[PDB]
Structure formats: C-alpha cells, structure tokens
Enzyme design. Structure first.
Site, PDB file in Angstrom:
ATOM      1  N   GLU A  39     -18.017  15.305  30.719  1.00  7.24           N
ATOM      2  CA  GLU A  39     -16.781  16.037  30.242  1.00  7.24           C
ATOM      3  C   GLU A  39     -17.731  17.449  29.925  1.00  7.24           C
ATOM      4  O   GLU A  39     -17.177  18.598  30.309  1.00  7.24           O
ATOM      5  CB  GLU A  39     -16.108  15.522  29.117  1.00  7.24           C
ATOM      6  CG  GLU A  39     -15.147  14.652  29.424  1.00  7.24           C
ATOM      7  CD  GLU A  39     -13.899  15.037  30.507  1.00  7.24           C
ATOM      8  OE1 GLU A  39     -13.514  16.253  30.282  1.00  7.24           O
ATOM      9  OE2 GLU A  39     -13.615  14.265  31.135  1.00  7.24           O
TER      10      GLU A  39
ATOM     11  N   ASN B 285      -8.322  25.835  32.959  1.00 11.83           N
ATOM     12  CA  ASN B 285      -7.441  25.066  34.195  1.00 11.83           C
ATOM     13  C   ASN B 285      -6.597  26.071  34.852  1.00 11.83           C
ATOM     14  O   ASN B 285      -6.502  27.308  34.340  1.00 11.83           O
ATOM     15  CB  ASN B 285      -6.526  23.968  33.635  1.00 11.83           C
ATOM     16  CG  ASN B 285      -7.587  22.906  32.935  1.00 11.83           C
ATOM     17  OD1 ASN B 285      -8.722  22.984  32.598  1.00 11.83           O
ATOM     18  ND2 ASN B 285      -6.815  21.588  32.746  1.00 11.83           N
TER      19      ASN B 285
ATOM     20  N   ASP C 171      -3.571  25.792  35.514  1.00 10.45           N
ATOM     21  CA  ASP C 171      -2.069  25.894  35.019  1.00 10.45           C
ATOM     22  C   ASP C 171      -2.153  27.009  34.001  1.00 10.45           C
ATOM     23  O   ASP C 171      -1.045  27.003  33.069  1.00 10.45           O
ATOM     24  CB  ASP C 171      -1.733  24.489  34.568  1.00 10.45           C
ATOM     25  CG  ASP C 171      -2.157  23.960  33.675  1.00 10.45           C
ATOM     26  OD1 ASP C 171      -3.328  24.450  33.013  1.00 10.45           O
ATOM     27  OD2 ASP C 171      -1.937  22.919  32.844  1.00 10.45           O
TER      28      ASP C 171
ATOM     29  N   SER D 119      -3.707  26.652  30.918  1.00  8.80           N
ATOM     30  CA  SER D 119      -4.594  25.800  29.929  1.00  8.80           C
ATOM     31  C   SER D 119      -5.829  25.980  29.833  1.00  8.80           C
ATOM     32  O   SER D 119      -6.548  26.319  30.967  1.00  8.80           O
ATOM     33  CB  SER D 119      -4.055  24.566  29.853  1.00  8.80           C
ATOM     34  OG  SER D 119      -4.402  23.693  30.979  1.00  8.80           O
TER      35      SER D 119
ATOM     36  N   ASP E  14      -9.390  23.664  28.260  1.00  9.02           N
ATOM     37  CA  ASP E  14     -10.168  22.329  27.674  1.00  9.02           C
ATOM     38  C   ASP E  14     -11.042  22.773  26.921  1.00  9.02           C
ATOM     39  O   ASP E  14     -12.046  23.580  27.184  1.00  9.02           O
ATOM     40  CB  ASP E  14     -10.863  21.354  28.866  1.00  9.02           C
ATOM     41  CG  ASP E  14      -9.509  20.955  29.927  1.00  9.02           C
ATOM     42  OD1 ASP E  14      -8.361  20.773  29.308  1.00  9.02           O
ATOM     43  OD2 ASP E  14     -10.040  20.865  31.216  1.00  9.02           O
TER      44      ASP E  14
ATOM     45  N   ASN F 217      -7.179  19.291  26.040  1.00 10.59           N
ATOM     46  CA  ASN F 217      -6.343  20.442  26.959  1.00 10.59           C
ATOM     47  C   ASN F 217      -5.495  20.977  25.808  1.00 10.59           C
ATOM     48  O   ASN F 217      -4.642  20.156  25.324  1.00 10.59           O
ATOM     49  CB  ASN F 217      -5.693  19.879  28.204  1.00 10.59           C
ATOM     50  CG  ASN F 217      -4.916  20.748  28.724  1.00 10.59           C
ATOM     51  OD1 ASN F 217      -3.626  20.835  28.678  1.00 10.59           O
ATOM     52  ND2 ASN F 217      -5.798  21.459  29.667  1.00 10.59           N
TER      53      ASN F 217
END
Ligand SMILES: [Cl-]
Lengths: 129, 112
Positions: free
Chosen positions: A35, A46, A48, A50, A52, A59
């Site tokens: 990760e 991301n 969309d 958002s 992380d 998220n």
C-alpha cells in the site's frame, strides 16, 4: 517516516494488530509494504477526487476528513492529516475499525493482490519481536 | 462475491417479493448488511430502512441475507441491490463501487 520492515512489525505488534479480527501480524506488514511502501506520508489521489492517506492508504471519501472530498463521511472521525503521522496510532485504530466490518482485509486491494494466499510469516521473519 | 437472486422478476400487485443474497468466496464473517432501491423512472438510488414491510433474514453460518418486501404495488417497480455495510452498519449505495464492500448484481422488479 519511511519505516523499516521489522521496525514496522514491532510497532504494529505493540499496537495490537497480531491476530486482530483473525489476521496475523504478517498480513498487516505486507499490506503496508504494498500500500505505502512503508512511508507514513504516502498520499495518493484517486480519479473520483478522493485521496488515500498514510501507511495503510485509507480513503477520504469514507474514513477521514480532508476538506476536499465531496460525499465525504468521516467514518473514523479523524482528520486525514492524522493518518500522515510518523506515529501510526491513528492509522492503526482506523484500520481496526475498518477491518471489524465489511470485507475484512480486502479493504486493502494491495493485500488482495500481493498478501492474501502467501506465506505472510515472511514479513516478520528475521525480526526481534 | 455477493450472489444476488433473482436477477429479474415480475409480480402482481398484492404479492410479496423475497430477494436472496449470499456472500461467497470469503474467509471473513458476514458483517453488517445493506439494501438499496432505485425506483423506475427515478435515477436516485436510496437505502431501504429495514423493518415493517421490509423483512431481512440473516444467517451467519451460511453468510446469507435475504429481504422480503410485502404488499407490492406499481410504486415498487425498480431495481434493488443488497450489499455489505461498513463501520458497523453504515450503508450508502456508493459502497458498491468501493474497495470497502461488495454488492449483489441487482434485482429488476416489474409489478403488474
Ligand atoms: Cl418471491
């Protein structure tokens, strides 16, 4: 902070992740490797809109508030900035909330891809724990 | 994976509908569960409040969750989806496209 593998395994163990919801400590270290590459400051947008955050790439649409994500739910009730500390406490406590419902450690796609169905004990071998 | 049946169904007004969902290929226990409806001609998907005319059956051993909808009318035509909740029971249709939950493939309901 970029953690060392055994350094992170130690920190995760003291933070109570070994066998949390049935997931042995190696799972968690392997998840962080794939990760965030062990980088507490990893911050990945991301598509969309958002983001992380942190060692476990949690998220901002669902779990924390970063102030820039519409549809944001802040289910861990923390600012996303807490997820970027050199202290992994906020990340761990959020991950424990995540994993205790929904799809377990499938919440970490890199865990599905590189950790699930491997000898995860490799990730804590060679460590003084 | 969440297997949702039936994929499509036609009912008469006054009948009930039961949709069955089963969580398969998972090594974790079934958590919280969620149900969503998008009414025909509407375009907003909405969570269903369980209770009253909406009856959920959960079996932890088989990781099965089913919804009965009582007393159907034309107002119930639309698409229905089950899924996994998060964070101890939080439901939102957008979970179905997320890495944090799985959802069934849907039931398209026509009511005569
Ligand atoms: Cl039926």
């Amino acid at each position: 902070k970029v953690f060392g593998r055994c350094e992170l395994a130690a920190a995760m163990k003291r933070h109570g992740l070994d066998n949390y919801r049935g997931y042995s400590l190696g799972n968690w270290v392997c998840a962080a490797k794939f990760e965030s590459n062990f980088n507490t400051q990893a911050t990945n947008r991301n598509t969309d809109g958002s983001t992380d955050y942190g060692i476990l790439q949690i998220n901002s649409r669902w779990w924390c508030n970063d102030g820039r994500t519409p549809g944001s739910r802040n289910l861990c009730n923390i600012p996303c900035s807490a997820l970027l500390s050199s202290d992994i406490t906020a990340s761990v406590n959020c991950a424990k909330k995540i994993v205790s419902d929904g799809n377990g450690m499938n919440a970490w796609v890199a865990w599905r891809n590189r950790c699930k169905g491997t000898d995860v004990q490799a990730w804590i071998r060679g460590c003084r724990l | 994976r969440v297997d949702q049946t039936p994929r499509s169904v036609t009912k008469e007004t006054g009948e009930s509908l039961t949709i069955n969902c089963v969580l398969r290929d998972a090594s974790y226990a079934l958590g919280s569960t969620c149900w969503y409806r998008k009414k025909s001609g509407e375009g907003n998907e909405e969570s269903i409040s369980k209770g009253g005319r909406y009856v959920e059956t959960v079996n932890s051993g088989s990781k099965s969750f089913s919804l009965r909808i009582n007393d159907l009318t034309v107002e119930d035509g639309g698409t229905y989806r089950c899924g996994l909740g998060v964070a101890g029971g939080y439901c939102d249709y957008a979970l179905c496209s997320s890495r944090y939950a799985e959802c069934g493939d849907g039931t398209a309901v026509t009511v005569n």
